[PDB]
Amino acid sequence: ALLQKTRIINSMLQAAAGKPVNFKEMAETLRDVIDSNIFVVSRRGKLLGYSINQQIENDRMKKMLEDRQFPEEYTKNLFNVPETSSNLDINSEYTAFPVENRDLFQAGLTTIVPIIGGGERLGTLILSRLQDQFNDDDLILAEYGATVVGMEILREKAEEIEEEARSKAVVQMAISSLSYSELEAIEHIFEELDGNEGLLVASKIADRVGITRSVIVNALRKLESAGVIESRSLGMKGTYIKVLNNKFLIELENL
Amino acid sequence: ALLQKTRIINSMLQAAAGKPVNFKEMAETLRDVIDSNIFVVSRRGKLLGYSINQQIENDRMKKMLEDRQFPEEYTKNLFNVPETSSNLDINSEYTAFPVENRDLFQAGLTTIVPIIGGGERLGTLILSRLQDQFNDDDLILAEYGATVVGMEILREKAEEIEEEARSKAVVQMAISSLSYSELEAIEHIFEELDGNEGLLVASKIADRVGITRSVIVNALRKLESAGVIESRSLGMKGTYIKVLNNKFLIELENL
């Protein structure tokens, strides 16, 4: 019953809007829609999700469902596949696969669609039934489905790193905003500290370090200012901090 | 064969990848694989791109094709469509459209798809033949179709501002690294200046402003460093400069 079938696939997509990416509850969707087996493997060939409904004969797939890694020779060509291969097992004649890719498709009549977003193969969609041949409708669905879980990892991954170089801009911001002293204080602080959690009253360092309180006491708050650290001191008599940004200590040690 | 017609689409989708989003050249690729009229209009109702073959009886649409600005009464109810209107003109019986959108659909047995990604109705997609019914799959194409133009405005507008908020980003930079002095200078400079184009001679400012050539002449380079302005000084005897970022000048005035 076509169109609905998809409109349904679409229904699902619209819906992932805010909610962060989630393959499985989306693999399901394809399973449901296409009534097929569904496994999504990334470029690196880690399964990000899959789903099923009845047991199978495929011995050489589970290996990965236990270490997330699939070895540097197997999934390897699984990737070399230039296009969709339509209907597939262990008894059809073709010289499109080399004799080093024998057992990967294995059990349940398997079909294959490459996931292919922003100009790049981001991975593969395995589908694999047992009996019912893979219909022209049935394909069209996957191709949408792939195309969908296409610009999704895309999405997910941008998300994933656009908030790396957030953190990372942040930190060379604040650090960009200290005096030779202030930062030197900060420096000497965490050289003589451990982790985000830190307590040793500023008072102490000053005399040792030979930077006034006043300042040390301040470099400090400059970080309260672009978030990076937290303390809300307890009337001197001890001074404690914890950090709000992992990429920091890192950077700071990068000095 | 519909699938072909679909995969054909796919192929054009991969091959936008690098190339900067082109609507027409996809409006066509629709009007190809669908065999109909394609018109992509937006949230605000601008016709981004379109694509036809024969001559048409819609009068009330040749309006936007010169001002790009559709009425605050037409496109809007065009916006109001909760979902895909399958076939249309002006003889049928329906209590959807409000008594204020009679002639927008005018020519071509018209059909309607809303474009929705980033969990947002990005705009509307308009197909319109003359006789042939829009079939099931005619839809099926059309929709996915949208869905692409879909996450294309996404990519374009995404692209639009990750680079408006670049300018801004770099100018808040450059400036931010200006000593009060230096800043004082660039200031005094452009206040007695007109547009991105300037020839006024450093020597003469210092005095008139109370600052060393030393520093004027420093603060200038600084912005060429961060490229914001161009000058290749001449051997004094007249300095001439140019601004290479619009956002900049704006920002100055906002200090």
Side-chain angles (χ1 to χ4, degrees), chain A residues 179-211:
Chain A
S179 93
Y180 168 66
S181 22
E182 295 166 309
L183 132 73
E184 199 131 351
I186 293 320
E187 283 296 36
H188 288 292
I189 274 193
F190 302 104
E191 167 199 320
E192 228 24 82
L193 202 81
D194 348 70
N196 325 150
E197 303 195 296
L199 190 143
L200 209 95
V201 229
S203 331
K204 233 200 209 167
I205 353 288
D207 346 50
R208 175 224 287 83
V209 177
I211 293 161

PDB file of all heavy atoms in Angstrom, chain A residues 179-211:
ATOM      1  N   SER A 179      45.617  38.702  31.978  1.00  0.00           N
ATOM      2  CA  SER A 179      46.939  39.313  31.980  1.00  0.00           C
ATOM      3  C   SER A 179      48.040  38.292  32.283  1.00  0.00           C
ATOM      4  O   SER A 179      47.798  37.230  32.895  1.00  0.00           O
ATOM      5  CB  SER A 179      47.005  40.520  32.931  1.00  0.00           C
ATOM      6  OG  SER A 179      47.466  40.196  34.240  1.00  0.00           O
ATOM      7  N   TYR A 180      49.251  38.647  31.860  1.00  0.00           N
ATOM      8  CA  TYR A 180      50.389  37.748  31.933  1.00  0.00           C
ATOM      9  C   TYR A 180      50.395  37.123  33.312  1.00  0.00           C
ATOM     10  O   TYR A 180      50.812  35.959  33.516  1.00  0.00           O
ATOM     11  CB  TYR A 180      51.693  38.490  31.675  1.00  0.00           C
ATOM     12  CG  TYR A 180      52.931  37.689  32.022  1.00  0.00           C
ATOM     13  CD1 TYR A 180      53.264  36.550  31.303  1.00  0.00           C
ATOM     14  CD2 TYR A 180      53.773  38.080  33.065  1.00  0.00           C
ATOM     15  CE1 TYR A 180      54.403  35.803  31.608  1.00  0.00           C
ATOM     16  CE2 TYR A 180      54.923  37.351  33.387  1.00  0.00           C
ATOM     17  CZ  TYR A 180      55.238  36.206  32.651  1.00  0.00           C
ATOM     18  OH  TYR A 180      56.383  35.473  32.956  1.00  0.00           O
ATOM     19  N   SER A 181      49.903  37.922  34.247  1.00  0.00           N
ATOM     20  CA  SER A 181      49.826  37.534  35.628  1.00  0.00           C
ATOM     21  C   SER A 181      48.615  36.619  35.813  1.00  0.00           C
ATOM     22  O   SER A 181      48.737  35.442  36.179  1.00  0.00           O
ATOM     23  CB  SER A 181      49.803  38.789  36.531  1.00  0.00           C
ATOM     24  OG  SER A 181      49.373  39.978  35.860  1.00  0.00           O
ATOM     25  N   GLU A 182      47.450  37.153  35.508  1.00  0.00           N
ATOM     26  CA  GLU A 182      46.251  36.458  35.818  1.00  0.00           C
ATOM     27  C   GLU A 182      46.453  35.056  35.306  1.00  0.00           C
ATOM     28  O   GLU A 182      46.369  34.076  36.061  1.00  0.00           O
ATOM     29  CB  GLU A 182      45.079  37.136  35.156  1.00  0.00           C
ATOM     30  CG  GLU A 182      44.847  38.530  35.693  1.00  0.00           C
ATOM     31  CD  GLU A 182      43.909  39.388  34.837  1.00  0.00           C
ATOM     32  OE1 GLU A 182      44.099  39.511  33.590  1.00  0.00           O
ATOM     33  OE2 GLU A 182      42.975  39.961  35.447  1.00  0.00           O
ATOM     34  N   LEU A 183      46.800  34.949  34.035  1.00  0.00           N
ATOM     35  CA  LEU A 183      46.909  33.629  33.475  1.00  0.00           C
ATOM     36  C   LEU A 183      48.030  32.851  34.146  1.00  0.00           C
ATOM     37  O   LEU A 183      47.905  31.645  34.374  1.00  0.00           O
ATOM     38  CB  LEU A 183      47.091  33.711  31.981  1.00  0.00           C
ATOM     39  CG  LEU A 183      48.202  32.884  31.372  1.00  0.00           C
ATOM     40  CD1 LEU A 183      47.924  31.403  31.338  1.00  0.00           C
ATOM     41  CD2 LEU A 183      48.320  33.417  30.009  1.00  0.00           C
ATOM     42  N   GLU A 184      49.112  33.534  34.483  1.00  0.00           N
ATOM     43  CA  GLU A 184      50.160  32.845  35.180  1.00  0.00           C
ATOM     44  C   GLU A 184      49.651  32.313  36.483  1.00  0.00           C
ATOM     45  O   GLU A 184      50.077  31.247  36.899  1.00  0.00           O
ATOM     46  CB  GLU A 184      51.323  33.756  35.463  1.00  0.00           C
ATOM     47  CG  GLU A 184      52.596  33.019  35.774  1.00  0.00           C
ATOM     48  CD  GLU A 184      53.723  33.575  34.965  1.00  0.00           C
ATOM     49  OE1 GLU A 184      53.427  34.403  34.064  1.00  0.00           O
ATOM     50  OE2 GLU A 184      54.882  33.178  35.212  1.00  0.00           O
ATOM     51  N   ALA A 185      48.764  33.055  37.137  1.00  0.00           N
ATOM     52  CA  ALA A 185      48.180  32.540  38.354  1.00  0.00           C
ATOM     53  C   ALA A 185      47.459  31.238  38.026  1.00  0.00           C
ATOM     54  O   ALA A 185      47.928  30.144  38.375  1.00  0.00           O
ATOM     55  CB  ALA A 185      47.266  33.521  38.954  1.00  0.00           C
ATOM     56  N   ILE A 186      46.351  31.361  37.313  1.00  0.00           N
ATOM     57  CA  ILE A 186      45.662  30.221  36.697  1.00  0.00           C
ATOM     58  C   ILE A 186      46.573  29.048  36.312  1.00  0.00           C
ATOM     59  O   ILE A 186      46.345  27.920  36.725  1.00  0.00           O
ATOM     60  CB  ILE A 186      44.889  30.711  35.479  1.00  0.00           C
ATOM     61  CG1 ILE A 186      43.760  31.634  35.941  1.00  0.00           C
ATOM     62  CG2 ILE A 186      44.371  29.566  34.648  1.00  0.00           C
ATOM     63  CD1 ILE A 186      43.011  31.196  37.218  1.00  0.00           C
ATOM     64  N   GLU A 187      47.578  29.326  35.500  1.00  0.00           N
ATOM     65  CA  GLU A 187      48.697  28.423  35.311  1.00  0.00           C
ATOM     66  C   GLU A 187      49.041  27.649  36.572  1.00  0.00           C
ATOM     67  O   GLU A 187      48.668  26.487  36.732  1.00  0.00           O
ATOM     68  CB  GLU A 187      49.931  29.239  34.951  1.00  0.00           C
ATOM     69  CG  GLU A 187      49.963  29.721  33.553  1.00  0.00           C
ATOM     70  CD  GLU A 187      50.033  28.576  32.608  1.00  0.00           C
ATOM     71  OE1 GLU A 187      49.404  27.531  32.897  1.00  0.00           O
ATOM     72  OE2 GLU A 187      50.725  28.719  31.584  1.00  0.00           O
ATOM     73  N   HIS A 188      49.752  28.344  37.454  1.00  0.00           N
ATOM     74  CA  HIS A 188      50.352  27.812  38.665  1.00  0.00           C
ATOM     75  C   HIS A 188      49.358  27.159  39.619  1.00  0.00           C
ATOM     76  O   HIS A 188      49.697  26.216  40.347  1.00  0.00           O
ATOM     77  CB  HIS A 188      51.085  28.944  39.392  1.00  0.00           C
ATOM     78  CG  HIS A 188      52.355  29.386  38.719  1.00  0.00           C
ATOM     79  ND1 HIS A 188      53.476  28.586  38.642  1.00  0.00           N
ATOM     80  CD2 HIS A 188      52.690  30.553  38.118  1.00  0.00           C
ATOM     81  CE1 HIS A 188      54.441  29.235  38.016  1.00  0.00           C
ATOM     82  NE2 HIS A 188      53.988  30.430  37.684  1.00  0.00           N
ATOM     83  N   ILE A 189      48.144  27.690  39.631  1.00  0.00           N
ATOM     84  CA  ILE A 189      47.004  27.050  40.281  1.00  0.00           C
ATOM     85  C   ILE A 189      46.935  25.569  39.943  1.00  0.00           C
ATOM     86  O   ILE A 189      47.235  24.738  40.786  1.00  0.00           O
ATOM     87  CB  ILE A 189      45.684  27.747  39.841  1.00  0.00           C
ATOM     88  CG1 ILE A 189      45.405  28.961  40.732  1.00  0.00           C
ATOM     89  CG2 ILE A 189      44.494  26.774  39.813  1.00  0.00           C
ATOM     90  CD1 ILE A 189      43.997  29.515  40.602  1.00  0.00           C
ATOM     91  N   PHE A 190      46.583  25.260  38.698  1.00  0.00           N
ATOM     92  CA  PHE A 190      46.233  23.903  38.296  1.00  0.00           C
ATOM     93  C   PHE A 190      47.437  23.013  38.077  1.00  0.00           C
ATOM     94  O   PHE A 190      47.278  21.801  37.907  1.00  0.00           O
ATOM     95  CB  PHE A 190      45.421  23.913  36.999  1.00  0.00           C
ATOM     96  CG  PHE A 190      44.153  24.715  37.059  1.00  0.00           C
ATOM     97  CD1 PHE A 190      44.073  25.955  36.452  1.00  0.00           C
ATOM     98  CD2 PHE A 190      43.033  24.216  37.689  1.00  0.00           C
ATOM     99  CE1 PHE A 190      42.905  26.688  36.494  1.00  0.00           C
ATOM    100  CE2 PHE A 190      41.860  24.948  37.726  1.00  0.00           C
ATOM    101  CZ  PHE A 190      41.796  26.180  37.125  1.00  0.00           C
ATOM    102  N   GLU A 191      48.625  23.619  38.016  1.00  0.00           N
ATOM    103  CA  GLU A 191      49.890  22.873  38.044  1.00  0.00           C
ATOM    104  C   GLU A 191      49.997  22.262  39.423  1.00  0.00           C
ATOM    105  O   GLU A 191      50.413  21.106  39.595  1.00  0.00           O
ATOM    106  CB  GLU A 191      51.089  23.798  37.823  1.00  0.00           C
ATOM    107  CG  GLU A 191      52.439  23.145  38.146  1.00  0.00           C
ATOM    108  CD  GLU A 191      53.552  24.148  38.366  1.00  0.00           C
ATOM    109  OE1 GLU A 191      53.608  25.146  37.621  1.00  0.00           O
ATOM    110  OE2 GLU A 191      54.378  23.935  39.281  1.00  0.00           O
ATOM    111  N   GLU A 192      49.607  23.074  40.398  1.00  0.00           N
ATOM    112  CA  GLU A 192      49.551  22.638  41.769  1.00  0.00           C
ATOM    113  C   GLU A 192      48.155  22.176  42.254  1.00  0.00           C
ATOM    114  O   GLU A 192      47.897  22.130  43.458  1.00  0.00           O
ATOM    115  CB  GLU A 192      50.197  23.685  42.676  1.00  0.00           C
ATOM    116  CG  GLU A 192      51.160  23.007  43.608  1.00  0.00           C
ATOM    117  CD  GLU A 192      51.657  21.669  43.033  1.00  0.00           C
ATOM    118  OE1 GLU A 192      52.592  21.704  42.205  1.00  0.00           O
ATOM    119  OE2 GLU A 192      51.087  20.597  43.377  1.00  0.00           O
ATOM    120  N   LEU A 193      47.290  21.803  41.304  1.00  0.00           N
ATOM    121  CA  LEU A 193      45.937  21.280  41.575  1.00  0.00           C
ATOM    122  C   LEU A 193      45.701  19.902  40.923  1.00  0.00           C
ATOM    123  O   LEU A 193      46.586  19.357  40.250  1.00  0.00           O
ATOM    124  CB  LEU A 193      44.873  22.274  41.074  1.00  0.00           C
ATOM    125  CG  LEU A 193      43.459  22.201  41.686  1.00  0.00           C
ATOM    126  CD1 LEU A 193      43.439  22.927  43.031  1.00  0.00           C
ATOM    127  CD2 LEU A 193      42.311  22.702  40.764  1.00  0.00           C
ATOM    128  N   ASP A 194      44.504  19.353  41.140  1.00  0.00           N
ATOM    129  CA  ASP A 194      44.049  18.101  40.520  1.00  0.00           C
ATOM    130  C   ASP A 194      42.554  18.201  40.175  1.00  0.00           C
ATOM    131  O   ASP A 194      41.733  18.521  41.044  1.00  0.00           O
ATOM    132  CB  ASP A 194      44.277  16.909  41.464  1.00  0.00           C
ATOM    133  CG  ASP A 194      45.164  17.257  42.656  1.00  0.00           C
ATOM    134  OD1 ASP A 194      44.715  18.021  43.541  1.00  0.00           O
ATOM    135  OD2 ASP A 194      46.312  16.775  42.701  1.00  0.00           O
ATOM    136  N   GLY A 195      42.206  17.937  38.915  1.00  0.00           N
ATOM    137  CA  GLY A 195      40.802  17.891  38.471  1.00  0.00           C
ATOM    138  C   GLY A 195      40.039  19.213  38.551  1.00  0.00           C
ATOM    139  O   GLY A 195      40.620  20.237  38.947  1.00  0.00           O
ATOM    140  N   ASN A 196      38.745  19.185  38.172  1.00  0.00           N
ATOM    141  CA  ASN A 196      37.808  20.344  38.293  1.00  0.00           C
ATOM    142  C   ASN A 196      37.578  20.742  39.739  1.00  0.00           C
ATOM    143  O   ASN A 196      37.233  21.883  40.036  1.00  0.00           O
ATOM    144  CB  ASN A 196      36.384  20.068  37.766  1.00  0.00           C
ATOM    145  CG  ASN A 196      36.324  19.164  36.554  1.00  0.00           C
ATOM    146  OD1 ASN A 196      35.338  18.436  36.376  1.00  0.00           O
ATOM    147  ND2 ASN A 196      37.332  19.234  35.691  1.00  0.00           N
ATOM    148  N   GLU A 197      37.696  19.755  40.618  1.00  0.00           N
ATOM    149  CA  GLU A 197      37.523  19.935  42.042  1.00  0.00           C
ATOM    150  C   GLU A 197      38.832  20.428  42.635  1.00  0.00           C
ATOM    151  O   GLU A 197      39.860  19.746  42.580  1.00  0.00           O
ATOM    152  CB  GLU A 197      37.120  18.613  42.684  1.00  0.00           C
ATOM    153  CG  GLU A 197      35.857  18.009  42.110  1.00  0.00           C
ATOM    154  CD  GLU A 197      35.300  16.923  42.987  1.00  0.00           C
ATOM    155  OE1 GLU A 197      35.999  15.907  43.154  1.00  0.00           O
ATOM    156  OE2 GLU A 197      34.172  17.081  43.506  1.00  0.00           O
ATOM    157  N   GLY A 198      38.791  21.627  43.190  1.00  0.00           N
ATOM    158  CA  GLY A 198      39.973  22.182  43.795  1.00  0.00           C
ATOM    159  C   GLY A 198      39.683  23.035  45.000  1.00  0.00           C
ATOM    160  O   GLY A 198      38.884  23.972  44.920  1.00  0.00           O
ATOM    161  N   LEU A 199      40.330  22.710  46.119  1.00  0.00           N
ATOM    162  CA  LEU A 199      40.337  23.612  47.272  1.00  0.00           C
ATOM    163  C   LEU A 199      41.695  23.837  47.944  1.00  0.00           C
ATOM    164  O   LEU A 199      42.286  22.914  48.525  1.00  0.00           O
ATOM    165  CB  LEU A 199      39.297  23.231  48.322  1.00  0.00           C
ATOM    166  CG  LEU A 199      39.203  24.358  49.359  1.00  0.00           C
ATOM    167  CD1 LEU A 199      37.782  24.576  49.834  1.00  0.00           C
ATOM    168  CD2 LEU A 199      40.163  24.154  50.546  1.00  0.00           C
ATOM    169  N   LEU A 200      42.129  25.101  47.867  1.00  0.00           N
ATOM    170  CA  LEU A 200      43.341  25.661  48.505  1.00  0.00           C
ATOM    171  C   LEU A 200      43.258  27.203  48.455  1.00  0.00           C
ATOM    172  O   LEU A 200      43.361  27.819  47.389  1.00  0.00           O
ATOM    173  CB  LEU A 200      44.609  25.178  47.792  1.00  0.00           C
ATOM    174  CG  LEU A 200      45.909  25.032  48.578  1.00  0.00           C
ATOM    175  CD1 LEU A 200      46.082  23.585  49.054  1.00  0.00           C
ATOM    176  CD2 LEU A 200      47.090  25.466  47.703  1.00  0.00           C
ATOM    177  N   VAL A 201      43.066  27.836  49.600  1.00  0.00           N
ATOM    178  CA  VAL A 201      42.714  29.253  49.584  1.00  0.00           C
ATOM    179  C   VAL A 201      43.771  30.076  48.851  1.00  0.00           C
ATOM    180  O   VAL A 201      44.976  29.843  49.007  1.00  0.00           O
ATOM    181  CB  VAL A 201      42.421  29.844  50.979  1.00  0.00           C
ATOM    182  CG1 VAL A 201      41.121  30.599  50.939  1.00  0.00           C
ATOM    183  CG2 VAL A 201      42.337  28.768  52.031  1.00  0.00           C
ATOM    184  N   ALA A 202      43.291  31.015  48.038  1.00  0.00           N
ATOM    185  CA  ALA A 202      44.135  31.838  47.166  1.00  0.00           C
ATOM    186  C   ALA A 202      45.274  32.472  47.963  1.00  0.00           C
ATOM    187  O   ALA A 202      46.441  32.526  47.525  1.00  0.00           O
ATOM    188  CB  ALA A 202      43.291  32.909  46.479  1.00  0.00           C
ATOM    189  N   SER A 203      44.899  32.932  49.148  1.00  0.00           N
ATOM    190  CA  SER A 203      45.814  33.453  50.150  1.00  0.00           C
ATOM    191  C   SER A 203      47.181  32.722  50.099  1.00  0.00           C
ATOM    192  O   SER A 203      48.256  33.359  49.987  1.00  0.00           O
ATOM    193  CB  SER A 203      45.125  33.347  51.529  1.00  0.00           C
ATOM    194  OG  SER A 203      43.689  33.432  51.412  1.00  0.00           O
ATOM    195  N   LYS A 204      47.104  31.386  50.121  1.00  0.00           N
ATOM    196  CA  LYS A 204      48.265  30.508  50.227  1.00  0.00           C
ATOM    197  C   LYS A 204      49.292  30.866  49.103  1.00  0.00           C
ATOM    198  O   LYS A 204      50.432  31.311  49.365  1.00  0.00           O
ATOM    199  CB  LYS A 204      47.787  29.021  50.150  1.00  0.00           C
ATOM    200  CG  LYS A 204      48.229  28.023  51.295  1.00  0.00           C
ATOM    201  CD  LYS A 204      48.147  26.481  50.912  1.00  0.00           C
ATOM    202  CE  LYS A 204      47.881  25.519  52.134  1.00  0.00           C
ATOM    203  NZ  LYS A 204      47.475  24.058  51.891  1.00  0.00           N
ATOM    204  N   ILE A 205      48.832  30.721  47.863  1.00  0.00           N
ATOM    205  CA  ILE A 205      49.662  30.764  46.667  1.00  0.00           C
ATOM    206  C   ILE A 205      50.448  32.043  46.615  1.00  0.00           C
ATOM    207  O   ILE A 205      51.677  32.030  46.559  1.00  0.00           O
ATOM    208  CB  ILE A 205      48.811  30.730  45.405  1.00  0.00           C
ATOM    209  CG1 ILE A 205      47.318  30.493  45.712  1.00  0.00           C
ATOM    210  CG2 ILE A 205      49.367  29.723  44.453  1.00  0.00           C
ATOM    211  CD1 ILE A 205      46.931  29.075  46.180  1.00  0.00           C
ATOM    212  N   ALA A 206      49.694  33.135  46.651  1.00  0.00           N
ATOM    213  CA  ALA A 206      50.199  34.493  46.610  1.00  0.00           C
ATOM    214  C   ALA A 206      51.623  34.664  47.109  1.00  0.00           C
ATOM    215  O   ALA A 206      52.483  35.151  46.383  1.00  0.00           O
ATOM    216  CB  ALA A 206      49.270  35.391  47.397  1.00  0.00           C
ATOM    217  N   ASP A 207      51.848  34.272  48.358  1.00  0.00           N
ATOM    218  CA  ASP A 207      53.133  34.458  49.033  1.00  0.00           C
ATOM    219  C   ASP A 207      54.198  33.576  48.362  1.00  0.00           C
ATOM    220  O   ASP A 207      55.331  34.039  48.043  1.00  0.00           O
ATOM    221  CB  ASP A 207      53.032  34.106  50.537  1.00  0.00           C
ATOM    222  CG  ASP A 207      51.570  33.979  51.055  1.00  0.00           C
ATOM    223  OD1 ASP A 207      50.731  33.267  50.446  1.00  0.00           O
ATOM    224  OD2 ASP A 207      51.283  34.575  52.116  1.00  0.00           O
ATOM    225  N   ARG A 208      53.807  32.305  48.180  1.00  0.00           N
ATOM    226  CA  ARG A 208      54.602  31.300  47.483  1.00  0.00           C
ATOM    227  C   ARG A 208      54.854  31.778  46.072  1.00  0.00           C
ATOM    228  O   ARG A 208      56.009  32.027  45.672  1.00  0.00           O
ATOM    229  CB  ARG A 208      53.847  29.965  47.409  1.00  0.00           C
ATOM    230  CG  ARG A 208      54.563  28.857  46.577  1.00  0.00           C
ATOM    231  CD  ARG A 208      53.612  28.090  45.642  1.00  0.00           C
ATOM    232  NE  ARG A 208      52.702  27.163  46.330  1.00  0.00           N
ATOM    233  CZ  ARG A 208      51.540  27.491  46.918  1.00  0.00           C
ATOM    234  NH1 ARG A 208      51.093  28.758  46.947  1.00  0.00           N
ATOM    235  NH2 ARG A 208      50.815  26.535  47.501  1.00  0.00           N
ATOM    236  N   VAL A 209      53.747  31.910  45.347  1.00  0.00           N
ATOM    237  CA  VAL A 209      53.757  32.236  43.941  1.00  0.00           C
ATOM    238  C   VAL A 209      54.353  33.624  43.684  1.00  0.00           C
ATOM    239  O   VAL A 209      55.104  33.813  42.727  1.00  0.00           O
ATOM    240  CB  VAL A 209      52.355  32.073  43.352  1.00  0.00           C
ATOM    241  CG1 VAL A 209      52.331  32.479  41.918  1.00  0.00           C
ATOM    242  CG2 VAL A 209      51.971  30.636  43.424  1.00  0.00           C
ATOM    243  N   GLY A 210      54.065  34.578  44.560  1.00  0.00           N
ATOM    244  CA  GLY A 210      54.570  35.928  44.366  1.00  0.00           C
ATOM    245  C   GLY A 210      53.701  36.628  43.338  1.00  0.00           C
ATOM    246  O   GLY A 210      54.187  37.330  42.447  1.00  0.00           O
ATOM    247  N   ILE A 211      52.406  36.395  43.444  1.00  0.00           N
ATOM    248  CA  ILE A 211      51.419  37.199  42.744  1.00  0.00           C
ATOM    249  C   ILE A 211      50.482  37.662  43.850  1.00  0.00           C
ATOM    250  O   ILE A 211      50.092  36.844  44.683  1.00  0.00           O
ATOM    251  CB  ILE A 211      50.654  36.347  41.703  1.00  0.00           C
ATOM    252  CG1 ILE A 211      51.604  35.910  40.557  1.00  0.00           C
ATOM    253  CG2 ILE A 211      49.372  37.078  41.228  1.00  0.00           C
ATOM    254  CD1 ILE A 211      51.131  34.676  39.669  1.00  0.00           C
TER     255      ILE A 211
END
